[PDB]
C-alpha cells in the first residue's frame, strides 16, 4: 500500500517546504522514508497498545510514541 501516496501529493508536500523543482527519483524514495517513519512510530504505539491490554490504538499511544522519539505533537491530548 506504499503506492497510495501519489507523486503530486509528495509534490505538494515539497511545495509546503519551499521546494521549487523536483526530480523524478524523489517521490518513490521519499515514500520509502515515509514508511520508515511509520516503521519508527506505529510499532512503538503498538507496544503501548500491548501495554494497556487493549486492541484499539488510541491517540494517546501515538502521542506517547511520538514524544518518546523527540517529535512532540500538540493538539491530540
Amino acid at each position: 500500500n506504499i503506492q497510495g501516496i501519489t507523486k503530486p501529493a509528495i509534490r505538494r508536500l515539497a511545495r509546503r517546504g519551499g521546494v521549487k523543482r523536483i526530480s523524478g527519483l524523489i517521490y518513490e524514495e521519499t515514500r520509502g522514508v515515509l514508511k520508515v517513519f511509520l516503521e519508527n512510530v506505529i510499532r512503538d504505539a503498538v507496544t503501548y497498545t500491548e501495554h494497556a491490554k487493549r486492541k484499539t490504538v488510541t491517540a494517546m499511544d501515538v502521542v506517547y510514541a511520538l514524544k518518546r522519539q523527540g517529535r512532540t505533537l500538540y493538539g491530540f491530548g
Binding site: 500500500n1 506504499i2 497510495g4 501516496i5 501519489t6 501529493a9 509528495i10 509534490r11 505538494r12 508536500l13 515539497a14 511545495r15 509546503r16 517546504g17 519551499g18 521546494v19 521549487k20 523543482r21 523536483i22 526530480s23 527519483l25 524523489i26 524514495e29 521519499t30 522514508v33 515515509l34 514508511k35 520508515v36 517513519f37 511509520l38 516503521e39 512510530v41 506505529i42 510499532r43 504505539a45 503498538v46 497498545t49 500491548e50 486492541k55 484499539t56 490504538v57 488510541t58 491517540a59 499511544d61 501515538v62 502521542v63 511520538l66 517529535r71 505533537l73 493538539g75 491530540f76
Partner: protein, 96 residues
C-alpha cells in the same frame, strides 16, 4: 494561448501551500498504509480517527522538515532541483 514559465507556478504553489495548513495527504490511502504496516507488528488491531489524524499530521510535518532540509542541501550544492542524494545527506546529518 497563455503558457506559464517553468518557475512561476512552482512559487505560486509554494506560497499557496505555505499560507494554508490543510492536510496534503489523502485519508484513505494513508489509513490503508498505516493499517498494513501495523498488521506486521500485531494482528487484529483497531485505530481511532484521532490517532490516524495525529499520525497523518506528524508524518506531514516530518516530510515538510525533510523537504526543507533537502531544498537547503540542494541550494548549498548550487542546484535548484532536489535529488535523492540530498535526502540521503539530510537523513545522515539528522542521525536517522
Amino acid at each position: 494561448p497563455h503558457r506559464y514559465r517553468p518557475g512561476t507556478v512552482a512559487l505560486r504553489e509554494i506560497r499557496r501551500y505555505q499560507k494554508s495548513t490543510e492536510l496534503l495527504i489523502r485519508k484513505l490511502p494513508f489509513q490503508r498504509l498505516v493499517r498494513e504496516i501495523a498488521q506486521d507488528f500485531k494482528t487484529d488491531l483497531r485505530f481511532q480517527s484521532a490517532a490516524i489524524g495525529a499520525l497523518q499530521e506528524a508524518s506531514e510535518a516530518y516530510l515538510v522538515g525533510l523537504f526543507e532540509d533537502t531544498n537547503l542541501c540542494a541550494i548549498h550544492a548550487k542546484r535548484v532541483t532536489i535529488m535523492p542524494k540530498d535526502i540521503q545527506l539530510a537523513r545522515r546529518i539528522r542521525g536517522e
